[PDB]
């Protein structure tokens, strides 16, 4: 039972190494990246219309740092007047 408790503590820690099958990257996987020779550039420029706002709120919740404040302006050079 001591080894059973040790297994429960460890569970399946070192068994996730094989589960890295999702890390492999292949060009042909994307459906629309290849239909034209420049479809890669089109899709890279297709998401320029999108931004963080267009992301789903739940997917935005997945963006966790490992809000603007009114008193931090972005610097300018010409000012106004």
Residues in contact with other proteins by the rule CB under 8 A: 1-12, 14-32, 34-37, 39-40, 43-44, 46-47, 49-50, 52, 54-59, 61-64, 66
Q: Least CB distance from residue 71 to other proteins, whole Å?
A: 27
Residue 10 class from Cβ within 10 Å (0-12 exposed, 13-18 middle, 19+ buried)? exposed
Residue 67 beta carbon to other proteins: minimum distance, rounded to whole angstroms: 17
Nearer to other proteins, 1 or 73 (CB): 1
DSSP category for residue 15: T
Q: What would the two tokens of residue 64 be?
A: 């966790």
Tell me how far, at minimum, the Cβ of 68 lies from other proteins, in Å: 18
Rama region for 61: left / alpha / beta (φ>0; ψ in -120 to 50; rest): alpha
């Amino acid at each position: 039972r001591l080894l059973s408790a040790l297994f429960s503590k460890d569970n399946f820690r070192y068994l996730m190494n094989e589960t890295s099958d999702g890390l492999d990257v292949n060009y042909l996987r994307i459906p629309g990246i290849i239909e034209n020779e420049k479809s890669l550039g089109k899709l890279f420029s297709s998401y320029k219309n999108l931004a963080i706002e267009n992301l789903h709120p739940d997917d935005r919740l997945l963006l966790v740092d490992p809000s603007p404040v009114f008193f931090l302006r972005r610097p300018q050079y010409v000012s106004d007047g």
